[PDB]
């Protein structure tokens, strides 16, 4: 629990699905990120238990929780702050003119978190380039991770619903509502496409009900450019029909390593 006469309120940083999110100070030192919890947006009581267990997730590729402000409306969540923003922006920005080893560190950033979540059986449930972030020094973190579970609005936790993340769910997701460790899985590798492809949209020609007919038929996303046969060859074992012959992250992150040396 932080006390809210610990922080300032500097600049607004855009919103989200909880609403506004700020850039401020906490203990006039430290650079944070504070979400103010929109009235109605989240199932706050849940959100408030759950909270315990998301201070404990520590790992240098997740975004740090400093702390919640929930004695009061509407509630704070205080995170380190990642000054570059979303990585999806950032991969859109041409001035970058990224290399491609900068690409597979950005994939084994991300690995990295994720490994971690799975070996805490912790799911993120909406892995995508829009909900990563990245700091000052260009790592890229997993944020918002496990936060899914406590939004209200139906357009977004429906499989059938306007804002539902359709071009980043496995098949069995869409159809039957079956979340694992192996629906995260292959979101990744929907991320990994997302920054071999600079940011494009995932079916970038399609709408959502033709992205979930077109995975149904066993069609998947054509290999970028930017990226190397291994590098396709591990986004794409993410995506197989059979969600138990897709691989762990930590398979994932030895792939990565491997062809990081290989490239
Ligand atoms: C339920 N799920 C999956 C959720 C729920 C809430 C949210 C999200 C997913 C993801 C989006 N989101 C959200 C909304 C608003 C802010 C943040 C958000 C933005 C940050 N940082 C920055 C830094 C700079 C800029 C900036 O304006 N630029 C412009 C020039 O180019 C360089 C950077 C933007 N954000 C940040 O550090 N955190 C921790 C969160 C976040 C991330 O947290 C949410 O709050």
Redesign the pocket.
């Given at each position: 629990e932080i006390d809210p006469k610990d922080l300032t309120f500097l600049?607004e940083?855009?919103?989200?699905?909880?609403?506004?999110?700020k850039?401020g100070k906490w203990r006039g030192q430290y650079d944070?990120?504070i979400?103010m919890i929109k009235e109605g947006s989240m199932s706050e009581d849940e959100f408030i238990e759950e909270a315990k267990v998301m201070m404990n997730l520590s790992h240098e590729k997740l975004?740090q929780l400093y702390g919640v402000c929930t004695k009061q409306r509407p509630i704070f969540?205080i995170?380190?702050?990642?000054?570059?923003?979303?990585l999806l922006?950032?991969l859109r920005?041409a001035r970058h003119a990224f290399q491609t080893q900068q690409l597979l560190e950005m994939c084994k950033d991300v690995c990295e978190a994720m490994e971690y979540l799975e070996s805490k059986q912790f799911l993120?449930?909406?892995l995508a380039a829009?909900?990563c972030?990245?700091?000052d020094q260009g790592v890229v973190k997993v944020?918002?991770?496990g936060?899914?579970?406590?939004?209200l609005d139906d357009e977004?936790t429906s499989s059938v619903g306007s804002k539902f993340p359709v071009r980043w769910s496995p098949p069995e997701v869409l159809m039957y509502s079956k979340f694992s460790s192996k629906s995260d899985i292959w979101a990744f590798g929907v991320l990994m496409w997302e920054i071999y492809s600079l940011g494009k949209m995932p079916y970038e020609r399609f709408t959502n009900s033709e992205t979930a007919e077109h995975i149904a038929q066993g069609l998947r996303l054509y290999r970028p450019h930017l990226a190397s046969a291994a590098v396709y060859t591990i986004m794409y074992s993410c995506w197989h029909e059979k969600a138990d012959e897709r691989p762990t992250f930590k398979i994932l992150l030895s792939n990565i390593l491997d062809v990081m040396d290989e490239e």
């Open positions: 600049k940083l855009g919103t989200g699905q909880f609403g506004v999110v850039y944070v990120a979400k975004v969540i995170t380190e702050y990642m000054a570059n923003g979303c922006n950032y920005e993120h449930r909406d829009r909900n972030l990245v700091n944020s918002d991770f936060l899914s579970r406590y939004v977004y």
